[PDB]
Design a protein around this ligand. Structure first.
Ligand code: HEC
Ligand code: HEC
Length: 171
């Protein structure tokens, strides 16, 4: 159990890339605001011990205690993710995939598990990178099941671009 109030100051070093409140202004860096505390904490441990490699964060988590990480996670989880706009040329394809999946190819809809990390409002650039990394097996911290890797295997590049654009505007 983290202390959100204590996490705010401990999160100051993170704001340079993720935003003071976790709402990053630049699309390369993911928004952390409003993300689930348990998801955030798991990603922090995965990044810290190398199960998920984020070279841009090398050395930042090294000296944070497990309590420090829980406080920071609690702080970001207490914020609210800001919501962007979808591209009108892509949003229909992206929303149809998000709500309906690809029934023909046995791909479940995203709404089954993602309303679990929060997705709605996340930068499209960041989401597309994660879906592509999942598909290519470069991100592998999705458990022994490899659910996201198996799901992203069914998405084309056009699918990923459209779903990512839809998610960016989702609220
Ligand atoms: C830029 C120099 C960063 C600073 C300072 C911090 N983070 Fe970071 N973080 C950065 C990038 C480029 C990425 C994404 C890499 C990729 O997969 O494309 C991240 C990612 C995270 C995550 C994962 C978020 C998710 O949605 O899965 C977390 C939990 C995270 N970062 C936490 C975190 C904390 C706690 C920081 C302060 C100590 C911090 N980051 C600083 C870049 C940068
Ligand atoms: C349940 C079986 C899921 C379905 C169906 C989909 N996703 Fe998923 N996703 C799931 C989990 C359990 C996780 C967390 C993995 C971890 O590293 O612990 C994820 C993760 C994502 C992410 C990364 C989020 C982040 O902040 O980096 C994205 C972008 C994502 N999932 C997207 C996504 C889409 C577009 C889906 C439908 C096509 C979808 N997921 C299905 C669980 C499940």
């Amino acid at each position: 159990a983290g202390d959100a109030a204590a996490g705010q100051a401990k999160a100051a070093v993170c704001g340079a890339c993720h935003g003071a409140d976790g709402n990053s202004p630049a699309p390369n860096f993911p928004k952390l605001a409003g993300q689930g505390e348990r998801y955030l904490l798991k990603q922090m441990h995965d990044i810290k011990d190398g199960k998920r490699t984020v070279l841009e964060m090398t050395g930042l988590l090294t000296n944070l205690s497990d309590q420090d990480l829980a406080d920071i996670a609690a702080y970001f989880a207490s914020q609210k993710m800001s919501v962007g706009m979808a591209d009108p040329n892509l949003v229909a394809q992206g929303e149809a995939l998000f709500r309906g999946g690809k029934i023909a190819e046995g791909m479940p809809a995203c709404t089954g598990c993602h309303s679990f990390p929060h997705l709605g409002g996340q930068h499209a650039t960041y989401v597309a990178k994660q879906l592509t990394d999942f598909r290519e097996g470069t991100r592998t911290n999705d458990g022994d099941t490899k659910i996201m890797q198996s799901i992203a295997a069914k998405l084309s590049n056009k699918d990923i671009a459209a779903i990512s654009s839809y998610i960016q505007g989702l609220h």
